[PDB]
Amino acid sequence: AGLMQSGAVMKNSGASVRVSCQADGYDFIDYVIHWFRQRRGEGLEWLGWMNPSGGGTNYPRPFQGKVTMTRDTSTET
Amino acid sequence: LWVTVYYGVPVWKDAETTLFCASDAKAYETEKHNVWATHACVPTDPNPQEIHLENVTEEFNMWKNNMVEQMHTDIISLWDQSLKPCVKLTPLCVTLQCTNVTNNITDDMRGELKNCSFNMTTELRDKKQKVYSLFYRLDVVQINSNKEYRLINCNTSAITQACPKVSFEPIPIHYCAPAGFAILKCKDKKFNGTGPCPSVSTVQCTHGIKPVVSTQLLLNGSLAEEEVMIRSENITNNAKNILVQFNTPVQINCTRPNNNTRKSIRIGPGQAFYATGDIIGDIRQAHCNVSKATWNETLGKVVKQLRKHFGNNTIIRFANSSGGDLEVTTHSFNCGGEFFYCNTSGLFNSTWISNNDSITLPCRIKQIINMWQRIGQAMYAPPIQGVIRCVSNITGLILTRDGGSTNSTTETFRPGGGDMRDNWRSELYKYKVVKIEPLGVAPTRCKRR
Amino acid sequence: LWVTVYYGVPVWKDAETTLFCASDAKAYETEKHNVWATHACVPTDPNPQEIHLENVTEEFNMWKNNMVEQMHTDIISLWDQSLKPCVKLTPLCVTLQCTNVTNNITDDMRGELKNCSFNMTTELRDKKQKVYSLFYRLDVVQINSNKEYRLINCNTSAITQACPKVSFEPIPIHYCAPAGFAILKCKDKKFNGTGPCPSVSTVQCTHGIKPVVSTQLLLNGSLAEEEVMIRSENITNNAKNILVQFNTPVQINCTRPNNNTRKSIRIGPGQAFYATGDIIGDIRQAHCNVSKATWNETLGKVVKQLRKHFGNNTIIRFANSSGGDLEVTTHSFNCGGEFFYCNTSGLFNSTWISNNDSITLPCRIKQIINMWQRIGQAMYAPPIQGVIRCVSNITGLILTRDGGSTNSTTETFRPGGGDMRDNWRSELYKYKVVKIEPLGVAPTRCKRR
Amino acid sequence: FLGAAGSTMGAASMTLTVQARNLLSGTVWGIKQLQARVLAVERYLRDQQLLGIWGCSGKLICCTNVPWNSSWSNRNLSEIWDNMTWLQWDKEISNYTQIIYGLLEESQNQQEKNEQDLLALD
Amino acid sequence: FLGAAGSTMGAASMTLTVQARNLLSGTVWGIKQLQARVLAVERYLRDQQLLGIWGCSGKLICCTNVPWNSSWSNRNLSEIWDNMTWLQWDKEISNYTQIIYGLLEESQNQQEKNEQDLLALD
Amino acid sequence: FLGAAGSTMGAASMTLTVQARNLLSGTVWGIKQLQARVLAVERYLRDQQLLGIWGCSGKLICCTNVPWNSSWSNRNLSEIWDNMTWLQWDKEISNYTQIIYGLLEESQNQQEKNEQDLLALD
Ligand SMILES: *[C@@H]1O[C@H](CO)[C@@H](O[C@@H]2O[C@H](CO)[C@@H](O[C@@H]3O[C@H](CO[C@H]4O[C@H](CO)[C@@H](O)[C@H](O[C@H]5O[C@H](CO)[C@@H](O)[C@H](O)[C@@H]5O[C@H]5O[C@H](CO)[C@@H](O)[C@H](O)[C@@H]5O)[C@@H]4O)[C@@H](O)[C@H](O[C@H]4O[C@H](CO)[C@@H](O)[C@H](O)[C@@H]4O)[C@@H]3O)[C@H](O)[C@H]2NC(C)=O)[C@H](O)[C@H]1NC(C)=O
Ligand SMILES: *[C@@H]1O[C@H](CO)[C@@H](O[C@@H]2O[C@H](CO)[C@@H](O[C@@H]3O[C@H](CO[C@H]4O[C@H](CO)[C@@H](O)[C@H](O[C@H]5O[C@H](CO)[C@@H](O)[C@H](O)[C@@H]5O[C@H]5O[C@H](CO)[C@@H](O)[C@H](O)[C@@H]5O)[C@@H]4O)[C@@H](O)[C@H](O[C@H]4O[C@H](CO)[C@@H](O)[C@H](O)[C@@H]4O)[C@@H]3O)[C@H](O)[C@H]2NC(C)=O)[C@H](O)[C@H]1NC(C)=O
Ligand SMILES: *[C@@H]1O[C@H](CO)[C@@H](O[C@@H]2O[C@H](CO)[C@@H](O[C@@H]3O[C@H](CO)[C@@H](O)[C@H](O)[C@@H]3O)[C@H](O)[C@H]2NC(C)=O)[C@H](O)[C@H]1NC(C)=O
Ligand SMILES: *[C@@H]1O[C@H](CO)[C@@H](O[C@@H]2O[C@H](CO)[C@@H](O[C@@H]3O[C@H](CO)[C@@H](O)[C@H](O)[C@@H]3O)[C@H](O)[C@H]2NC(C)=O)[C@H](O)[C@H]1NC(C)=O
Ligand SMILES: *[C@@H]1O[C@H](CO)[C@@H](O[C@@H]2O[C@H](CO)[C@@H](O[C@@H]3O[C@H](CO)[C@@H](O)[C@H](O)[C@@H]3O)[C@H](O)[C@H]2NC(C)=O)[C@H](O)[C@H]1NC(C)=O
Ligand SMILES: *[C@@H]1O[C@H](CO)[C@@H](O[C@@H]2O[C@H](CO)[C@@H](O[C@@H]3O[C@H](CO)[C@@H](O)[C@H](O)[C@@H]3O)[C@H](O)[C@H]2NC(C)=O)[C@H](O)[C@H]1NC(C)=O
Ligand SMILES: *[C@@H]1O[C@H](CO)[C@@H](O[C@@H]2O[C@H](CO)[C@@H](O[C@@H]3O[C@H](CO)[C@@H](O)[C@H](O)[C@@H]3O)[C@H](O)[C@H]2NC(C)=O)[C@H](O)[C@H]1NC(C)=O
Ligand SMILES: *[C@@H]1O[C@H](CO)[C@@H](O[C@@H]2O[C@H](CO)[C@@H](O[C@@H]3O[C@H](CO)[C@@H](O)[C@H](O)[C@@H]3O)[C@H](O)[C@H]2NC(C)=O)[C@H](O)[C@H]1NC(C)=O
Ligand SMILES: *[C@@H]1O[C@H](CO)[C@@H](O[C@@H]2O[C@H](CO)[C@@H](O)[C@H](O)[C@H]2NC(C)=O)[C@H](O)[C@H]1NC(C)=O
Ligand SMILES: *[C@@H]1O[C@H](CO)[C@@H](O[C@@H]2O[C@H](CO)[C@@H](O)[C@H](O)[C@H]2NC(C)=O)[C@H](O)[C@H]1NC(C)=O
Ligand SMILES: *[C@@H]1O[C@H](CO)[C@@H](O[C@@H]2O[C@H](CO)[C@@H](O)[C@H](O)[C@H]2NC(C)=O)[C@H](O)[C@H]1NC(C)=O
Ligand SMILES: *[C@@H]1O[C@H](CO)[C@@H](O[C@@H]2O[C@H](CO)[C@@H](O)[C@H](O)[C@H]2NC(C)=O)[C@H](O)[C@H]1NC(C)=O
Ligand SMILES: *[C@@H]1O[C@H](CO)[C@@H](O[C@@H]2O[C@H](CO)[C@@H](O)[C@H](O)[C@H]2NC(C)=O)[C@H](O)[C@H]1NC(C)=O
Ligand SMILES: *[C@@H]1O[C@H](CO)[C@@H](O[C@@H]2O[C@H](CO)[C@@H](O)[C@H](O)[C@H]2NC(C)=O)[C@H](O)[C@H]1NC(C)=O
Ligand SMILES: *[C@@H]1O[C@H](CO)[C@@H](O)[C@H](O)[C@H]1NC(C)=O
Ligand SMILES: *[C@@H]1O[C@H](CO)[C@@H](O)[C@H](O)[C@H]1NC(C)=O
Ligand SMILES: *[C@@H]1O[C@H](CO)[C@@H](O)[C@H](O)[C@H]1NC(C)=O
Ligand SMILES: *[C@@H]1O[C@H](CO)[C@@H](O)[C@H](O)[C@H]1NC(C)=O
Ligand SMILES: *[C@@H]1O[C@H](CO)[C@@H](O)[C@H](O)[C@H]1NC(C)=O
Secondary structure (H helix, E strand, O other): OOEEEOOOOOOOOOOOOOOOEEEOOOOOOOOOEEEEEOOOOOOOEEEEEEOOOOOOEEOOHHHOOOOOOOOOOOOOO | OOEEEEEOOOOEEEOOOOOEOOOOOOOOOOOOOOOOOOOOOOOOOOOOOEEEOOOOOEEEEOOOOOHHHHHHHHHHHHHHHHHOOOEEOHHHOOOEEOOOOOOOOOHHHOOOOEEEEEOOOOOOOOOOOOEEEEEOHHHEEOOOOOOEEEEHHHHOOEEEEOOOOOOOOOOOEEEEOOOOEEEEEEOOOOOOOEEEEOOEEEEOEEEEEOOOOEOOEEEOOOOOOOOOEEEOOOOOOOOOOEEEEEEEEEEEEEEEEEEEOEEEEEOOOOOEEEEEOOOEOOOOOOEEEEOHHHHHHHHHHHHHOOOOOOOOOOEEEEOOOOOOOHHHHOEEEEEOOEEEEEOHHHHOOEEEOOOOOOEEEEEEEEOEEOOOOOOOEEEEOOOOOEEEEEEEEEEEEEEEEOOOOOOOOEEEEEEOOOOOOHHHHHHHOOOEEEEEOOEEEEEOOOOOO | OOEEEEEOOOOEEEOOOOOEOOOOOOOOOOOOOOOOOOOOOOOOOOOOOEEEOOOOOEEEEOOOOOHHHHHHHHHHHHHHHHHOOOEEOHHHOOOEEOOOOOOOOOHHHOOOOEEEEEOOOOOOOOOOOOEEEEEOHHHEEOOOOOOEEEEHHHHOOEEEEOOOOOOOOOOOEEEEOOOOEEEEEEOOOOOOOEEEEOOEEEEOEEEEEOOOOEOOEEEOOOOOOOOOEEEOOOOOOOOOOEEEEEEEEEEEEEEEEEEEOEEEEEOOOOOEEEEEOOOEOOOOOOEEEEOHHHHHHHHHHHHHOOOOOOOOOOEEEEOOOOOOOHHHHOEEEEEOOEEEEEOHHHHOOEEEOOOOOOEEEEEEEEOEEOOOOOOOEEEEOOOOOEEEEEEEEEEEEEEEEOOOOOOOOEEEEEEOOOOOOHHHHHHHOOOEEEEEOOEEEEEOOOOOO | OOOOOOOOHHHHOOOOOOOOOOOOOOOOOOHHHHHHHHHHHHHHHHHHHHHHOOOOOOOOEEEEOOOOOOOOOOOOOHHHHOOOOHHHHHHHHOOOHHHHHHHHHOOOHHHHHHHHHHHOOO | OOOOOOOOHHHHOOOOOOOOOOOOOOOOOOHHHHHHHHHHHHHHHHHHHHHHOOOOOOOOEEEEOOOOOOOOOOOOOHHHHOOOOHHHHHHHHOOOHHHHHHHHHOOOHHHHHHHHHHHOOO | OOOOOOOOHHHHOOOOOOOOOOOOOOOOOOHHHHHHHHHHHHHHHHHHHHHHOOOOOOOOOOOOOOOOOOOOOOOOOHHHHOOOOHHHHHHHHOOOHHHHHHHHHOOOHHHHHHHHHHHOOO
């Protein structure tokens, strides 16, 4: 089962990008998602979470507006 | 010492059973066929039948509870029911030559509503039916030409039209248990949802409860009493939504302020459609008004009632939502049949320290829901002619704590929600189901023949 | 002598009641919503609860039995259930511009599969939808032009598409009775289905049983033990099909050996179709392999186990079927969702007297069933990408005796079947339902006050 | 549980305690086992009723103020508790159960409790 | 009704009469309260059965021909009717209820009613 | 069966044995007679419960340690078993049934079985 992270990718200063977590093996709607980051030799960091139900989230203070995490219930993604 | 048993003893334990409603009598008479959905719901014990309990304390857990999920499965069951025989809508996923508006109603109501035109099944099978109707912007979607749109649902989920005879009025329901099962009823006013509650009664026919349908804002609910109350399964867990109950009723007046007109379209036989017609006179957006200073003082007593957990001096701040579906990002709810989504943005741009008109926030109306993520079926909210006005009390709120990783520096909140079950927990906080066993045996120097 | 009654006495008689399943616990956890169909089936007594019986003999009749037909009505009931909410297919009885194949796959797989192309409802109502899909030869039919075909069902019976979330895996089910009713359990290994059985236990929760679905060949079933067993209601009646149970498991490996691809066609809203795409790489026919010499020796021990009825020296011969529908003329069955029909012709062209690779017989796949003659509805067997492989044990067989009117000259057999109920009798052979009455009165010189 | 119905009646008499133990032991397709449990309860209660309307009701065993009938298969005392079994008896008894019941339920307690009233007064 | 489970056992003993009063007190979504009432009846009857198979059956209170066991929490006479409550007892008792039942339902009436037969004859 | 409710009470007293005989006597549209049989059982059991919680339980007839009340329609001994019928009585009695029940179910066995305990000890 598990989850599908898209492959690594390069972009550019400024700019913007989108990343995919595909879910297989259970209830997309139940349960909740979080995201995390490890920089160049760094203690891991929390990014944010989404309940895939209504869609409610919570972005930590220093990353609000920076990040935009979402879901698609039908694609279960 | 011998043994001797006793039938009727005071002993029970943690169990959860099936339970039944109770909808009293004066609801029973209103002629016009069927009501809410309580078809065979049996009326209420007209006397308060409760028994105070002496020197007993046991532990309520408002999240480990069950009758909340009982009522949840119940209401999605009767949701399915309600519409099950109602009119289908399969000939609406059709192309839609549309446009905007023609009346002096400001950009405040610019377009948004749409004047679509399209063919349709007649009563018969052969003839088509060139027709036209008016729709809120969120019911339609572009497709790559003049103005042909699609309904939002037609790539996801079929849709049925509610029988117009249904009315969306929450009615006080008395959930009542069977015997062998009792409801322990907590009777202090300071019970943060978890733990043992000393002040208790025993009850079977819980009070009349309206299953109010709203996000972020909790409507017509129960009061708290002295010191407004707040509850979390473990608030340090920010992700645990926070549910709050007021000791103070918040006045709220909502209004969809346009005089509509209805179209009994004939997609017959039998199945008749109900469309929007053109509107009477001016056009203005639905919205709601609330008493400014009462709002002020309630959020006062709140922010007073929180720093206890977060240090008598901490930085508080509120904000508009973290971005969700229209149900969670706004105050979604129903009034008088149709469905509002209120931009609750205006009531949180604030920061709180330590110890004049009235507020008009606007709401936009939508007619296409598939609620409880129950997609596969959508409900067409039929139109209502005339205008709509709505008196309501606000009694609680669903909120989200920001996780500002510091120590106890700055903590900020927003109206949470999404999971509807809390609007039930918020009146289920005060009940526990117990299975009694009337048997209990004791040793004693007593002989038989 | 007076009279005196007794409550709990050991007396019962021939009765048949309603009974309930039992599906144990480790089946209960696999997350993903619903299983087989056991939604409320209650788990199994985790201990073998049985009682051997002393000096009791009474008569089992495996054909006069009932719980077989109980399970039969049960399974067609849940068959109806299973698909009841699943996706309809009414826009498929449509003309079908088709053709054959384009890949180096021999005449062994020549055409047979078809590459049809046709219009379709969109998500919306207006637009058509030019599309194309691939089908087994037996799903389609000519009509008097290039290559326009029809689905087989469209002149007989509508069709629904199974919800893909369903899986066709037989799971051991424990049929369990109520009280007052007992199951007498025969415990010799030599019980030709009829007559009294001395070696018996009493039981309520019968063993876990998989309702394997196959014709001629009996799969994953129960073993016999020492001397393979055979049963007929009266075999002299040739028309009485003969059911045989093995003491020996027959290895069988089936394979549909092509890597498919699936199409979530959008005939929306909601209702999404699932079509065949083009195939990965080479194409080869489904088939099955079986260990030659084990087959040899099992049919040995059989032909040894039959002439007892037909003289220690009689002419035996087997053959391919007497011509029936594809279900009975071949080894019909399911593996991994999709549905095989195996040309069991190859395993019977033999003649038996008195006292090396491995066998590869091919099977062709069909997706359109209406099984149990339950026409009026058909099931679309949806596709599966990748390849399919299937380990199975063969444990019994359904056969037909030729009526060669002589005296006991030559008698010849073929794989019978058709009536599915035998695959149940073949594990129902060992049970009888008895209604106990706990009451029994006797004369005796005892007085009351 | 129903241990040895083939053991004779006098042997079997030792315990009548487990056959009366598991005899209760604590959506369509879901309607059915409800329909089954309910008549299991009715059978139990039909029993307890036929029981209480007899002087019995006192569970399991109960002596009675009516004797035997010759014709009802004249036999012997050791021929049945030592040489017979339960169904073995009731298959024979099938031919007379009805008026047996009829006479118990009438000619007993009705007389017996009325006579009792005639002494439950003084 | 369940008035004061926190009152001690000797106080609570005064009436055992209302907890046994309202314990019965006289379409889908309509199937459910049927499914509930039915097992309320079964629980009542499981009770009455466990009761009658004991020498009890005589409602509410019933003395019995088996005494105590030391190890089963040796305590005192005034420490429980004057200082304890009901669940307070049965939470302790949870650890031994089973063989208690087992010995009642067997070693009692079965012996007791057979001995009774041994005198209900002469 | 309900033979002659118009025969007087003393005549009717002779048999109370058949009205208690057929009183149990052994898909939608199929759900209904289930819903009916079930409350027939509940009515029977409500009866047997109201019965057992009285000193009665002993079926059919049962003398009791509470007498009469003057005001409850003072009448005579021959005026009712020889000149009245059953409903004829209970239509009058409709006005007092409740506290009748209330006093039986309390002031009787509760006192009576506790006093019995007070002698079931020595
Ligand atoms: C939620 O909150 C929002 C925001 O506050 C509310 O929106 C308000 O909505 C109301 C009605 O929906 C609007 O009322 C209209 O006001 C206009 C303008 O009136 C002004 O100018 C005149 C002179 O030009 C003044 O005399 C007016 O003074 C009014 O108020 C004072 C008190 O402040 C009062 O003493 C005056 O007499 C006068 O009131 C009325 O007096 C007599 C009777 O007493 C009456 O005959 C007269 O018509 C006055 O209305 C004011 O400063 C006014 O022209 C409108 O009336 C006309 O047009 C409409 C449309 O055709 C007709 O229906 C009507 O009969 C008149 O012909 C309205 O009265 C208001 O402007 C608006 N905004 C604000 C800031 O209040 C929502 O209503 C709230 N909703 C809910 C559910 O809570
Ligand atoms: C049911 O029963 C039927 C009938 O028996 C089975 O059908 C068989 O199916 C298999 C696979 O599905 C077929 O296998 C293929 O064989 C070909 C031809 O191989 C021959 O020629 C070469 C030289 O040209 C010989 O060296 C081969 O010898 C093989 O077998 C011997 C033992 O007999 C072994 O010692 C050899 O090493 C060799 O085996 C393999 O060796 C190495 C690893 O050990 C491996 O790298 C090599 O590729 C050999 O396969 C033999 O005489 C062969 O070319 C095929 O391989 C290639 O093509 C496929 C297709 O692209 C690729 O997937 C694969 O990787 C290779 O590139 C296959 O191996 C077999 O011919 C066929 N028929 C018979 C009679 O066996 C079913 O499979 C059975 N199914 C079930 C469910 O039971
Ligand atoms: C929404 O759009 C519909 C289009 O289907 C509008 O209906 C049509 O509106 C036009 C004007 O916009 C009408 O035209 C005029 O009609 C009158 C009377 O027939 C005639 O005297 C004029 O010469 C001109 O042709 C048209 O009749 C009307 N048709 C129908 C069936 O309603 C509708 O007015 C729009 N509504 C809003 C609120 O924008
Ligand atoms: C919370 O309680 C208030 C108080 O009743 C509710 O206000 C009520 O709103 C409904 C419509 O949503 C009104 O119903 C309609 O009333 C009019 C006239 O009364 C009648 O013409 C209609 O046929 C319909 O019955 C209702 O009257 C009104 N209450 C009162 C006292 O007038 C409010 O709806 C409740 N909250 C929510 C979310 O519904
Ligand atoms: C929550 O509050 C924040 C800020 O308090 C709102 O942020 C704002 O987001 C909107 C939409 O993303 C931005 O709007 C843009 O404005 C231009 C010019 O008016 C308009 O032409 C564009 O079409 C676009 O809508 C806006 O710049 C941005 N910042 C501010 C200060 O408004 C956010 O919309 C609020 N969200 C909710 C759900 O309440
Ligand atoms: C089954 O039949 C369908 C027909 O609907 C085949 O799809 C079509 O197959 C043809 C070739 O047989 C494709 O033509 C070529 O397309 C490519 C890419 O567009 C182009 O470069 C060539 O010039 C030529 O036009 C056609 O595109 C293709 N269309 C679709 C929508 O698939 C399908 O290949 C057949 N499959 C098998 C296994 O036979
Ligand atoms: C008779 O019993 C055998 C033994 O289990 C059955 O073989 C089984 O076949 C099924 C498919 O029909 C396999 O299920 C699938 O398994 C794979 C990997 O195990 C998994 O990826 C799939 O999601 C699915 O669960 C099953 O694994 C396989 N048994 C074993 C032990 O691997 C056979 O199906 C039975 N007979 C019949 C007629 O079904
Ligand atoms: C059972 O076995 C018999 C014989 O053992 C099979 O009989 C044969 O039937 C087929 C079809 O009726 C005949 O086939 C013809 O063959 C020609 C040339 O190969 C072909 O071009 C025709 O299209 C036709 O199919 C065949 O002559 C006939 N005899 C033999 C010896 O094969 C029968 O098919 C088997 N049936 C089953 C259900 O196993
Ligand atoms: C409603 O149906 C009419 C036909 O009665 C449509 O009018 C046709 O529109 C198509 C657009 O593709 C033109 O090609 C035809 O020439 C039109 N006239 C005809 C067929 O007489 C009209 O577009 C439809 N409106 C919808 C679907 O919204
Ligand atoms: C909304 O529009 C309708 C239709 O124009 C109004 O209905 C009329 O109302 C007036 C005044 O109440 C009556 O005299 C007419 O007889 C009504 N006619 C019809 C066909 O309904 C309605 O009144 C408007 N809304 C309000 C609040 O006045
Ligand atoms: C919400 O509506 C109620 C009723 O329409 C308003 O209450 C009235 O308030 C006015 C003054 O604002 C008083 O003169 C009335 O006597 C009140 N009547 C009732 C029934 O309450 C309330 O003020 C409104 N609040 C807002 C924010 O619009
Ligand atoms: C799918 O629909 C197309 C039309 O979009 C069909 O193409 C037409 O086929 C008919 C055959 O009778 C011709 O007379 C027309 O000239 C064709 N072109 C058009 C209408 O533009 C096509 O045959 C359909 N394919 C099916 C039903 O398999
Ligand atoms: C059947 O075909 C599919 C599609 O080509 C194969 O799927 C790929 O498998 C390879 C190897 O396992 C992976 O590296 C790819 O990421 C897969 N892609 C997709 C889209 O599924 C599949 O593997 C083939 N069957 C087998 C048995 O290999
Ligand atoms: C059916 O499949 C099984 C398993 O794939 C085969 O059994 C294997 O047989 C080979 C030799 O034939 C052994 O080396 C393996 O150790 C066996 N493994 C298992 C798990 O059984 C069996 O031979 C196959 N039979 C046929 C007729 O194809
Ligand atoms: C006993 O049965 C015989 C049958 O031979 C019958 O004549 C007799 O009347 C029966 N006894 C009584 C008391 O009825
Ligand atoms: C039965 O008992 C009688 C005496 O009452 C005796 O004569 C006869 O032999 C006995 N027979 C059997 C089979 O017990
Ligand atoms: C009482 O419990 C003790 C446990 O210490 C056990 O040894 C003893 O056997 C029990 N009494 C009886 C009569 O079994
Ligand atoms: C219990 O009673 C014993 C005598 O049997 C006495 O020694 C002891 O102090 C008492 N303790 C309590 C707690 O009652
Ligand atoms: C009998 O009824 C009378 C009514 O006149 C009442 O006064 C009296 O108290 C009743 N008897 C008892 C014992 O309560």
